């Protein structure tokens, strides 16, 4: 299957409550492997997966140093963003960064990412070409000018085509037991009456990895998109994920409804019904 590595930055200002907090988390697909928090007693990069513990002491030193320096850089960024939007030093603000690479089954680069946001709104984004930028507004346009002069896109390109894919290939090999294992969902349909003439059919998907999954209800082989209640995919706490789809159904007509399940752990898509 295909794979991805992502790092997520969150820099949060907190006037009156000390210097801005800087947090970094790293992921391979939907598995957390590394963590940094500037509010920790001894701030450093910490392992969150067994297959990253292997890495030598030099790896951990470099990674920590990057985070400690980024803590300083993103504090400067928050100050810079205040001038760009003419804001006071009294409010709390958040800069977020989302970057990494996707690789194909062969381990070759599919595409790279590097995008930022300010207060939950898109700020700047590196385009798929890994050489041009998209700025959301005139503030980020100033950042764009600064990055184009400093040949920043070219530095991303070299990383995304170089170190990003190289390390992700190593991580996938070392953690092959889990990262290259797809756990299929366990599925069943529940039945709860609402009225005397209305029943809720809920299609469960439990214990599946990765998170990507499709659950659809069909009435006589016809999709019920606008009539299906579909909750967000939630983590179970053991690496796996959970999801359910529900439909309000007239009693007697339960056998006209079929749940359809799509997940990479299944060789074929599953069709299930309420089994009385």
């Amino acid at each position: 299957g295909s794979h991805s590595m992502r790092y997520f930055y969150t820099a949060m200002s907190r006037p009156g409550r000390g210097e801005p907090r800087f947090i970094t988390v790293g992921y391979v697909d939907d598995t957390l492997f590394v963590r940094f928090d500037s509010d920790a007693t001894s701030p450093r990069k910490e392992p969150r997966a067994p297959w990253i513990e292997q890495e030598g002491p030099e790896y951990w030193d470099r990674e920590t140093q990057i985070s400690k320096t980024n803590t300083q850089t993103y504090r400067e960024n928050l100050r810079t963003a205040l001038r760009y939007y003419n804001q006071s030093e009294a409010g709390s603000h958040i800069i977020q960064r989302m970057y990494g690479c996707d690789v194909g089954p062969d381990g070759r680069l599919l595409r790279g990412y590097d995008q930022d946001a300010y207060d939950g709104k898109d700020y700047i984004a590196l385009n798929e070409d890994l050489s041009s930028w998209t700025a959301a507004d005139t503030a980020a346009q100033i950042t764009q000018r600064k990055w184009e002069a400093a040949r920043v896109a070219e530095q991303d390109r070299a990383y995304l085509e170089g170190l990003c894919v190289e390390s992700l290939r190593r991580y996938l090999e070392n953690g092959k037991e889990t990262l290259q294992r797809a756990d299929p969902p366990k599925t069943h349909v529940t039945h709860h009456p609402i009225s005397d003439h209305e029943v809720t059919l809920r299609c469960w998907a439990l214990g599946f990895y990765p998170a990507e999954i499709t659950l659809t209800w069909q009435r006589d082989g016809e999709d019920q998109t606008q009539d299906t209640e579909l909750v967000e995919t939630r983590p179970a706490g053991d690496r796996t994920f959970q999801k359910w789809a529900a439909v309000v159904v007239p009693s007697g007509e339960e056998q006209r409804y079929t749940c359809h399940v799509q997940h990479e752990g299944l060789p074929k898509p599953l069709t299930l019904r309420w089994e009385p």
Binding site: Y7, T24, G26, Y59, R62, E63, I66, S67, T69, N70, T73, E76, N77, T80, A81, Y84, I95, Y99, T143, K146, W147, A150, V152, Q155, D156, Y159, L163, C164, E166, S167
Partner: peptide, 9 residues
């Protein structure tokens, strides 16, 4: 592995 060099806003 993280990208070493970062750029100011």
């Amino acid at each position: 592995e993280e990208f070493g060099a970062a750029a100011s806003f």
